[PDB]
Subunit: 412 residues, 2 copies
Amino acid sequence: MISLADLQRRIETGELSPNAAIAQSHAAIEAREKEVHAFVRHDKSARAQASGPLRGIAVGIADIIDTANMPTEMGSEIYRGWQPRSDAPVVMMLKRAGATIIGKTTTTAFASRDPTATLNPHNTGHSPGGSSSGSAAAVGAGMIPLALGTQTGGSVIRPAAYCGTAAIKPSFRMLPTVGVKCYSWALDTVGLFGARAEDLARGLLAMTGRSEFSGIVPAKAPRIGVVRQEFAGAVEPAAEQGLQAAIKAAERAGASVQAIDLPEAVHEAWRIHPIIQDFEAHRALAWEFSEHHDEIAPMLRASLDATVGLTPKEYDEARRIGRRGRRELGEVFEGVDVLLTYSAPGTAPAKALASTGDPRYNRLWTLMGNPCVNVPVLKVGGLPIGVQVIARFGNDAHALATAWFLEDALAK
Amino acid sequence: MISLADLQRRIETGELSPNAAIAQSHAAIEAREKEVHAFVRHDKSARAQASGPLRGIAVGIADIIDTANMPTEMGSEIYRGWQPRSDAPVVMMLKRAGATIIGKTTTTAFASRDPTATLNPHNTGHSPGGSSSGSAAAVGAGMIPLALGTQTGGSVIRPAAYCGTAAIKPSFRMLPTVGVKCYSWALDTVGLFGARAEDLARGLLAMTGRSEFSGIVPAKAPRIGVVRQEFAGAVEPAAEQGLQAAIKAAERAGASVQAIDLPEAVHEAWRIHPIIQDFEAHRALAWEFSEHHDEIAPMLRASLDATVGLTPKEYDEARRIGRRGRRELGEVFEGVDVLLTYSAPGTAPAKALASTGDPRYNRLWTLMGNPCVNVPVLKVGGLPIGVQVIARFGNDAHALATAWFLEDALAK
């Protein structure tokens, strides 16, 4: 994969020119796009900017995020050929930093369950995950150094784990969702894909300009709390194998690891994730549901058809439970620096299954808002397996530092 | 002015038909548009829908709110002829309930301070206020029974007070802001204009389907707390005349009224509103600021230029102060049912002043998120003056009930 931090350092000392770096990505995309299909639109004439921390850095954008110079089709036939007037704030954050928007990456229709045609870089017979399938696949295949994705029902952490890339879903709202096609305003969050934790750090620093992302270095003797999210049921063998491998590597690196239970209130928040999601989606996608019902991707269409009756009453109740979860979850971070858990149920599903994978081990954290980071651990049958680092809300930097720590630990 | 509730009743019983109701607004609009200039575009072909509680109800929409059959120009030349593909969720809430979208009403550029050409129905030589100038004036001119507006730096309460109409800014996030051009995601809220509180109630019931808005009736002996927002400086005499008139009417009507001082924290929250507004506006309008800078209306453009230096640190600090303010404000409501305060600095400013009026007495509440309702009180020199009823967050229904009680109280 291409390292953003690496390119940065070389472009900074003058070893690599921005134009050469951008030409690099175009070639890397050309070399695998025909077999992976991660791009809805590759702008072959996209060029490097002459200044800024991200000059020479190519970035792929999940297609529910507005771009002014390229179409934003939402991964749906309903928005075929649709062209937004402006670039979404998140795209402008990259551009203002000198980045090059190299193209739009595939996304599941409206960021839901319906599979795209993108294939897993490690085995074209498997799913790259969702909802931001293209961004994960593109980074995993070494096409681009960075990519923006989104999440609602799940997290960028799952497709990242499937494709073996690093990724982070920042604290809720840190990255604006303006210009990001709404599925659920309570959940919708923007995330980043990269080669390693360090690349995510540099990427967020340039985008937000927040000092918390400046000077990040691997953590030391982290206090890790292992949670297996029992409420979501047992994971597949491959996933557990990856968790055990990560714990062992971390311990051998000086980290204190302990198994922890998640408070009952937190278990409840996980349960009502669907209520919040679907109730809000009915309002957010009202025009689509009313005017273009049969044009909505099958799986998403069905989920909506089945939740038309959700009441404002049970919705308010769900949010109430959600908040109680956030409070008590915070309490869990009074005795630990970061949590360590599964990134997915296991290895990426075969495409034949027509599934982007179950988001059950990702949904809670997206609802709570905590920053999560995927750390590739091992591979089973050639398919990547990862684990995710989760820190207290607003502690994004610490999440990245511990993830960086885990990476070095796994490298031994 | 036209009463939504009135229209509902008459149409329900059969006294009036939906087609006739709509025809009347088309006529009303045609009768004074050349005098008021409230509509960006009037869809003369709009007809009544067949079923629904709002069948026969013509509704005007502030032009930063997406509509799929009419342009959405954001009150800016940058978006001239811009045509969204979808209707915003709030527009869908209306359509689904059977309403008729009769047109788009003028809005200050990006819902900021730049004056539109719209004039005050009570006095063409005066401003109708902002940011939703057209919605307020159109309702004030008796063109339509309902209109949607937005608020960021102020509140629909101010233009409503300027034009002598009722209005409510529901609890933050009750009405989705998807498809509503973002100015500040922490403040952006949708509101309603109508003849009286009852009209707003029925309007919200139909839009949200929330039972709290069903069967609302005037409150009895409400516990009112009077706040004069001294942190906002001196108010104009006409404004105090109205507040006093309201207080006297309320007392005569059986309400218990006491003067109270808001906590320092609340004064602080009011102070940092601009910080949250402007820091976010730079992210929310990045594309416009970077690519079409000189095209941004003068006043907004100036407010942005002077704030390019706002840092994420002071922004975070500003939001800290905001939260404290909300926490301590809620405590105030343990003594009274609602708060009563000024809706504006005084009577509507002359158009010659090139100002939509100072939002200083509105901004605090929009940031806190509490539901606010405007209650017309009297007129000085022919210009309307109102007061606003504010309730605990989530207590929209009681704010309306209390506003209704006040209306009857003033009616003597």
